[PDB]
Amino acid sequence: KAAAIGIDLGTTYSCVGVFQHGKVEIIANDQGNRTTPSYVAFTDTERLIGDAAKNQVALNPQNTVFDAKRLIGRKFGDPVVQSDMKHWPFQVINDGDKPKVQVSYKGDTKAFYPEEISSMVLTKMKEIAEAYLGYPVTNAVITVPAYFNDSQRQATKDAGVIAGLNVLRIINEPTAAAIAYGLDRTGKGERNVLIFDLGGGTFDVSILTIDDGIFEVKATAGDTHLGGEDFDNRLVNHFVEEFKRKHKKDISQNKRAVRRLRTACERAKRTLSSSTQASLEIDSLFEGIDFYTSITRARFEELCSDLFRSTLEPVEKALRDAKLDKAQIHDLVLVGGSTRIPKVQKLLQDFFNGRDLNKSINPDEAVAYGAAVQAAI
Ligand SMILES: N#Cc1ccc(COC[C@H]2O[C@@H](n3c(NCc4ccc(Cl)c(Cl)c4)nc4c(N)ncnc43)[C@H](O)[C@@H]2O)cc1
Incomplete structure (x- = not known):
């Protein structure tokens, strides 16, 4: 009988997985990517979903949802x-x-x-799963943020039904992240889990309690407008001033010059998660000038210091709401692509007094992973 899929329906990015033969498979799309942007574009001749919609954004801003x-x-x-x-x-x-x-x-x-x-966006994730499994898919588990109310959960289930799926259940993303690491499989007794989620455009901190596989949401805190994109903004704003200092020209009123500097900045920040230095090399950035420069992990940490430090406030609010002490948290889970930033990891580990973080599962795929596991139960 057909397998049920686990869907991570994200604000900026989506992911779909399947549990088969005691193993979890995070399904790649027709372009070989295991993550699809949560974008839909309407053109003169067609509707585009995912990367196809994201790649034409600057040429159709008004009709790209x-x-x-x-x-x-x-x-x-x-x-x-x-x-x-x-x-x-x-x-x-x-x-x-x-x-x-x-x-x-x-x-x-x-x-x-x-x-x-x-x-x-759900029709695309479904179709990605069918090309892989080789048959039509009906059953799915779709995840939602733990703070979502009943109207938002009904509306998310409705999207599944419209996409042609039988939504077996709607579960919380922090719940799916703990299921991926098998924290629900420790038996009788109380375990306190803190899930730290830092994505492309959102930041959520959740505290759950697991007693005999039964989950209880105790606290939720964060910032719906803090993510990876803000780190790109600080880099972009740093290189605009550097171009001024060097060439005495303002690149901010050219749309293509700003779009090209953004791409370069995203990748640079990304290199700095495994490297102490990254280099930016853009040919004819503005006024025919080549922008051949560099940034260090240290200068990057300086430009974003307030943003990295603010991630500790919702950790403190969540502990105080859940009426728990930091020593009371048994497990720490890292979810979201931005959690790859070493300073983000240092800050969370130091707050929790050098304790070990659960981060071996790809941070972009961990939510879909657990949701596939849950879908197979
Ligand atoms: N292909 C692809 C692809 C895969 C996953 C994602 C999800 O990204 C969400 C957030 O996660 C951020 N991020 C990511 N995302 C994972 C990723 C992997 C491959 C590619 Cl090409 C891209 Cl660009 C992104 N990696 C980071 C890193 N090494 N250091 C710091 N931040 C990183 C990213 O900048 C964004 O803010 C986005 C694109």
Whole structure:
């Protein structure tokens, strides 16, 4: 009988896995990537999902939808919805106090619900799983952040149903992360787990209790607008001033010059997780000038120091809400691609007095991993 899949439906990035033959397989897409962007684009002739939609973003900003997870199951008048709208190139209209994203598709003006947009991202993850398994997939477990209310969970389940799946259950992402490491398999007694999630655009800290495989959410804290993208912003803003100091020219009012500097900065930051120095080499960046420069891991840590240090406040709030002491936490799990930053790891380990972090499972894949495991139960 057909296998059930585990879907990690992320704000910026999505991942799908399957549990088969006592093993977990994180499924790669038609481009060989195990992570797909949570993007949907509407063109003159077609609808694009994932990387195909992400790669054409600058040539179609208004009809490339992303961040649907920020709107899913919320009301238009919601303050969250109202402040986020100011930063999106796509139009968000009001229908009965329900948000709808409005775009131009095949000559026509069309409006879709956030659950309709996420259903498109879920249709892609499903199809990725079917090409691998060689048969049509029906059953799925889709994850949600632990702080999500019942409207947001119903709306997420609705996306699965619209995508053609039978949503067996909706579980929490920190729950899926603990299941991946087998912390639910320790038996009778109380274990306290802290999951530290630092992704592309979101930051969540959760405290769970596991007693005989039964999970209890005790505290949730964080910042829905803190992630990897902010670290790129500090690097970008650092190299704009450096180009000024050297060439006496402002690159910020050229869209392509800023887009190209961003790409370079993302990769650099990435090199610095395993290296003490990274180099930036952009040909004809602005005014015909080649920008051949370098940054150290130390100068990078300096530019982001306030951001890395602020990740300890929601750790303190979560402990104080859960009414626990740091010595009371039995396990520490690292989830999210930004947790690869050595300074992020040093800060969390030092706070927890040199204790060991659970990080061997790819931080981008750990949530889908556990969700596939849970889907097989
Ligand atoms: N291909 C691919 C791909 C795979 C996973 C992701 C998810 O990324 C989410 C966040 O995770 C960040 N991140 C990632 N993401 C994993 C990744 C792996 C490969 C590629 Cl090409 C890319 Cl770019 C990203 N690696 C980091 C690192 N080594 N040091 C610091 N931050 C890292 C990334 O910059 C982003 O902010 C994004 C792209």
